[PDB]
Amino acid sequence: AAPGKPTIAWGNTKFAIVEVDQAATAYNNLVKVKNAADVSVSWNLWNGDTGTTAKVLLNGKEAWSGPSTGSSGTANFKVNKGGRYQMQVALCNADGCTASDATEIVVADTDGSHLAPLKEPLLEKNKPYKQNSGKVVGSYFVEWGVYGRNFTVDKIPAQNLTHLLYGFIPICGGNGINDSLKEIEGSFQALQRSCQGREDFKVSIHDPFAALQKAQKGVTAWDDPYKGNFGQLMALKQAHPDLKILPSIGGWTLSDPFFFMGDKVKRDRFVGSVKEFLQTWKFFDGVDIDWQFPGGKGANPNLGSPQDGETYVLLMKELRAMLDQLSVETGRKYELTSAISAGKDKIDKVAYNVAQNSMDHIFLMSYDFYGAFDLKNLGHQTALNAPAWKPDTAYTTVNGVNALLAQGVKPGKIVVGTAMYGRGWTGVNGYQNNIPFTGTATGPVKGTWENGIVDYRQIAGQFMSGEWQYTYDATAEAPYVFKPSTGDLITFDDARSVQAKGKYVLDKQLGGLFSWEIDADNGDILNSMNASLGNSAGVQ
Ligand SMILES: CC(=O)N[C@@H]1[C@@H](O)[C@H](O[C@@H]2O[C@H](CO)[C@@H](O[C@@H]3O[C@H](CO)[C@@H](O[C@@H]4O[C@H](CO)[C@@H](O[C@@H]5O[C@H](CO)[C@@H](O[C@@H]6O[C@H](CO)[C@@H](O[C@@H]7O[C@H](CO)[C@@H](O[C@@H]8O[C@H](CO)[C@@H](O)[C@H](O)[C@H]8NC(C)=O)[C@H](O)[C@H]7NC(C)=O)[C@H](O)[C@H]6NC(C)=O)[C@H](O)[C@H]5NC(C)=O)[C@H](O)[C@H]4NC(C)=O)[C@H](O)[C@H]3NC(C)=O)[C@H](O)[C@H]2NC(C)=O)[C@@H](CO)O[C@H]1O
Secondary structure (H helix, E strand, C coil): CCCCCCEECCCCCEEECEEECCCCCCHHHHEEECCCEEEEEEEECCCCCCCCEEEEEECCEEEEEEECCCCEEEEEEEECCCEEEEEEEEEEECCEEEECCCEEEEEECCCCCCCCCCCCCCCCCCCCECCCCCCEEEEEEEHHHHCCCCCCHHHCCHHHCCEEEEEEECECCCCCCCHHHHHCCCHHHHHHHHCCCCCCCCECCCCHHHHHHCCECCECCCCCCCCHHHHHHHHHHHHCCCCEEEEEEECCCCCHHHHHCCCHHHHHHHHHHHHHHHHHCCCCCEEEEECCCCCCCCCCCCCCCCCHHHHHHHHHHHHHHHHHHHHHHHCCCCEEEEEEECCHHHHCCCCHHHHHHHCCEEEEECCCCCCCCCCCCCCCCCCCCCCCCCCCCCCCHHHHHHHHHHHCCCHHHEEEEEECEEEEEECCECCCCCCHHHCECCEECCCCCCCCEEEHHHHHHHCCCCCCEEEEECCCCEEEEEECCCCEEEECCCHHHHHHHHHHHHHHCCCEEEEECHHHCCCHHHHHHHHHCCCCECCC
C-alpha cells in the first residue's frame, strides 16, 4: 500500500533571502543578502507505513528529497525566489506517493514579492488621476517624516505619481566628510553608528529604525523581515508595478561627501556601493543624485571647487555605466536622475548639456528662490516669472529652464519643480504701494516644523482666513498671504501657480513636474500637477 499521509509539523513558515539582523545598529550587520533563503520543514506520520522516500514539494515541484527513516523527519533546503508557496511533504514507496495537505510558506525578498499590495485609499483632498500624459509627476518622501509629521508610505497618493523619490540615503563619513550633518541634533552621530565598520564614501541608511524596523501598515508582524519605509515601499511596488521609486542620495545636509569625489578611488567606491545597494534593495528603480551643490554655496562654507562640474559629469557617466550593466544583468530598466539648483550662477558651474546624455531626468529645483535666509531682499520663492515690480529678478523658474536650454539641454529632460511648502518672514515693514515684497523683514515666520517654512496644508488650513490677505500675482504666477499687523509674509505655490507651471511645461515640451515634499500637501498641489499636465481624472 502507499505510505500513510504525513502531517506537516507546526513551525516557522516565514523565511527571507535578504536576512535582517534584529539586534544590529550598524548597516554592515543589519542586512545579509544570500543567494537563497534557508528553509526548513518537519513532519510526523500519525498513521501508517512511513514510505521509503520523503520529499518536500513547493507548488508540486520537488525542493528536497531524502530517505524516509521513521515517523518524523526534517528537511533543510534553499529557495532562491521570493513569493508564497504551497508546500507539501509527500512520502513515497513503490506502491505510490501520499502528499500532506498544503501549508503556505513565505519566502521574502526585497522586491516585495512576498507582500500583499499596499493599495490604500486616497486621503485628504487627493483625487484620482490616470498617468496617461507621458509626463513626469514626481514627489519626494522623507525618511524622517514618519515621526512628528506622522506621514507614512501608506499615506502617499501613489496612483497620482510616476516617480517617488526617497530622501535621503547618506554617504558614510565622519569628521571633515559629513560636517554639515552636525547642524542637526544627533544626526551626525546617527550616521556614524550606522556606518560603524563601513568604509567612508559608501552609501548606508541614515535611520535604520525608520527605514526598516518601525511597525507600519501591512508590515506589523514581528517576523515580517522588512518593515518601516522600505517594507511599505516594497508593498507599494506590488500595488504599482510601474511607479518608479528612486533612492535620493544627498540633499542639503548630506552633500559634503560629493565634494571629495574628484578622487576616483572614492568615486569608484561610491559607485560600487550604489550598485550593491540596488542589488540589496530590489524595489528601487535607479538612483537620484542630489548634490547641493557643485561649486559650493551649499550647507558647508568650506567646500566647493572649480573641479566640481567635471566630477559631476564623470560621476553621472560612471553611474549610468554601472546602471546599464545592472539593467542587462536583471532585464530591468534603471533610471539615473539628479535634483539641481535652478539658480543660473549654480547651473553654469556644470555642463548639463553633456551630463544629460547619462540621465533620464533633471529635477530642476525651481523653488527656494527667496526666503528667511535673506531678510533684506524679499521675493516669490517659486514663481514662474519675475514680478511687475522687479522684471529683472534673477531667480525665477523660467530663468533656470532657460539657463539649461542655453547650455544645450534637451527640453524633454527638464522636470520643473513645485513647492508643497511656503517660505516666509515676520515683521515685514517699509514696503511701497501695498507690495510687501518691496519691504524688509525682522526674522522668519513661525513654521510648522522649522522656522521660516510652512507646510502648504497649514497655509490652506490656517492662513487663508482671518486677517490674512491673499493675492495671486498673475505676472509672476505666484500666490502670497500677508498679515499686515504682524508683518507675516508667506510665499508658496497653490493650485493656480502649479497649473501655470504645468501649462508652461506642456507649452515648452518639458519633461513634467515634481514637488518637495509629499507629506506637506493636502491634495491641492498634486491634484493640480496631474490636471495641468493633462492626466485624465479617474483610475485604470
Ligand atoms: C536661486 C538660489 O540659489 N537660491 C538659494 C537657495 O537655493 C538656498 O536654499 C537652499 O536651497 C536648496 C535648493 O536649491 C534646498 O535644498 C533642496 O530643497 C529642499 C527644500 O528646501 C531641501 O529640503 C530640506 O532638506 C533638509 C535635509 O537635507 C531637511 O532637513 C531635515 O530637517 C528636519 C527638521 O525639520 C530634520 O527632522 C528631524 O529628523 C530627525 C532625524 O535625524 C528626527 O529624529 C527622530 O525624532 C523622533 C521624535 O519625534 C524620534 O521618534 C520617536 O521615537 C521613535 C523611534 O525612536 C518613534 O517611533 C516615535 O514616533 C517617536 N517617539 C517620541 C519620543 O516621540 C526619533 O527617535 C528621533 N531620533 C533622532 C534624534 O534621531 C526628528 O524627529 C526630526 N524632526 C522633525 C521636526 O521632523 C531632518 O533630520 C533633516 N534631514 C536631514 C537628512 O538632515 C529640511 O527639513 C528640508 N527643508 C524643507 C523646505 O523641507 C532638500 O534638502 C533639497 N532637495 C533635494 C531634492 O535635494 C535647501 O533646503 C535650501 N537651504 C536652506 C538653508 O534653506 C539658499 C541658502 O543657501 O540660498 C539661496 O540663494
